Amino acid sequence: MISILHYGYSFIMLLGALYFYLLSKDPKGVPASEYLIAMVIPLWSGAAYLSIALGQGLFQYDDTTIYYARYIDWVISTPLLLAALALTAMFGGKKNLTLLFSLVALDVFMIITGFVADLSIGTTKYIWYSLGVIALIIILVITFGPLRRIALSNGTRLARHYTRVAIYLSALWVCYPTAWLLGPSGLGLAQELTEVLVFIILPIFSKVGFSIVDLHGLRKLHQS
Amino acid sequence: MISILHYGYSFIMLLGALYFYLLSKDPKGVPASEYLIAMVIPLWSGAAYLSIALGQGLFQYDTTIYYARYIDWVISTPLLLAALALTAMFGGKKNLTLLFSLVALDVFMIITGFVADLSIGTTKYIWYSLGVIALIIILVITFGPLRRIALSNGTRLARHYTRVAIYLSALWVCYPTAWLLGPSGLGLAQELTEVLVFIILPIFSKVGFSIVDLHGLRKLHQ
Amino acid sequence: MISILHYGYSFIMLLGALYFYLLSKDPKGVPASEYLIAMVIPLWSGAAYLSIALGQGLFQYDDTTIYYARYIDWVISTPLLLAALALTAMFGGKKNLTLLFSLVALDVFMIITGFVADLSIGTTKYIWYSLGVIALIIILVITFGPLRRIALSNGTRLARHYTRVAIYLSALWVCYPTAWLLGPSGLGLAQELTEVLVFIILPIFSKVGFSIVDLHGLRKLHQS
Ligand SMILES: CCCCCCCC/C=C/CCCCCCCC(=O)O
């Protein structure tokens, strides 16, 4: 069942990427860079999850299955999602690439702490997990603080769209460390199959859902 | 013999890089970034192939995986496509989105090759096929939208671009062909033959390409 | 012993990063990108050395301890330090990102040769070490040649500051390959504890000391 779920996920990622490609052909004032980012996120994730479907992207460690292909996925897809969010805030204004790369750095560190925590046991595991959670808190502080202030500097209509996708992204993102802690990588309260379903459904919304809402909202700002 | 071929390769890469450095000192209207890219490609490849010469950049899996080849290509091949894109854009506005589209496709392509090499049976050919699909899209971009940019930069630039695009594309299709025929794939081609192909092809891909590319761009100065 | 030194190192990196953050809030004409770089260097190094403190970032090879987390640290922190130095040379002037990325490329290669040399034995070890030393020599030639000429083009006061931080960086940097060759990774003349103390004290000056001197000097060019 786990294999079939991963095949299905990869198929949905492909469909999402094809949809964003089709939107890119009639871009409605959204820069090409934002369509490229929107396409890479699901295609990379789809490839990583295909490796799990094929029985390759996992190994046995600490009497648990480490789905290491999830970290290979997230270390590329998640910094790209924050790049997408930052570029939304900066729509119609001067780009702040310092703030954008601040988020990329925090995010890559966050994913690495997750991988190291998964390979760790006892107190060491929760030290790495906690550092990752601290990185996520700083990402959320930037998202609702200085980055939202950039969105507000780009006017009422853009700031409304930004706030919507910031809440969409943030709601989904806090679910990942929650599921991690509850599942076999952490306290082992949630069953492996349950964790697998959560890390199938969440990313469908994080990777395809997010960019449908984001791109549609930006395209709507276009005065045709 | 395999060790000696790799030492010789590394020496040729070094000579190519030194030649591109010498050209960089009298640049004839070619931006410094294009000389840097032209130098990094062979120096990185030379270092990777040196590891094979020293007997380090390979492991047994029941055949030899020359993993240092993937460490080489994952850096050198995206840089080659960056060089090709910047040639198309010579004298005009840059399209960094198209450039990074090629970089993304190319890094994915090399990764599928590495995963395919570590894979067995149907799984191997699934990864190989995804890499081939990435290469086809790279070629579609190369002869489609990227060539259109070259044409927008005038007849003489477009002629040079078309020449180096065919040069790069002809060599690039050889890599997956050799991979499939050799011990990583169907095992029809002998290991020593595959080794020679993955010595001679890259000499043309990495040094040959940038000799033709830089000479052509420098000639546009007059 | 070695664990405690690494915990202490990580704490100093954290304090350094917090100081650079506080300076960033009253930036005195120094671009935000230069504060971000100054903060990432110690935070990354701190995390890498924390892994050694926890007994994770090392393994046994050729009867010796390979502190591989040092290379994970340097492969990110050292290119960022050269980026910081290049941006100092370019202060108040046109950026030369080609020269900056030339240094990044040389530097990443240098650290990789160090790691490969550490995993190598006999003549092979010293071939990789020598390639690393050649990369460092080219970095120093760029630093005191073309990069210094950029600094001179940005006026007397900037060029004086650049020359000071360039000599500071270069004096510390030549110590790393020297300690490597003398310690267990090389000729094995110095004890493991001696090498550990050098690769604790040097980086405190290379990562925190350097950016105190750099940022203070740049902030001083500000007319209040
Ligand atoms: C361990 C592996 C770590 C890999 C990290 C990879 C991170 C990739 C993300 C990069 C996002 C950069 C996007 C920049 C957008 C440019 C802005 C513009 O379009 O003008």
Ligand SMILES: CCCCCCCC/C=C/CCCCCCCC(=O)O
């Ligand atoms: C693991 C995969 C990492 C691959 C990284 C390799 C680097 C490839 C990227 C090249 C981009 C080059 C961009 C040059 C822009 C020049 C612009 C100008 O000079 O005006």
Ligand SMILES: CCCCCCCC/C=C/CCCCCCCC(=O)O
């Ligand atoms: C192993 C991979 C190595 C990773 C390298 C990480 C660091 C790369 C260096 C980047 C420095 C960024 C410099 C940007 C200059 C900004 C100035 C400007 O353009 O205004």
Ligand SMILES: CCCCCCCC/C=C\CCCCCCCC(=O)O
């Ligand atoms: C594996 C990497 C771990 C984390 C390191 C990430 C490196 C990126 C962070 C900082 C580099 C600074 C680059 C951004 C400056 C751009 C400013 C500008 O151009 O205006």
Ligand SMILES: CCCCCCCCCCCCCCCCCCCC
């Ligand atoms: C403000 C809205 C934020 C989210 C937008 C999209 C909606 C996503 C809803 C969450 C998806 C479900 C995740 C948990 C699934 C649990 C399945 C368990 C099966 C045993």
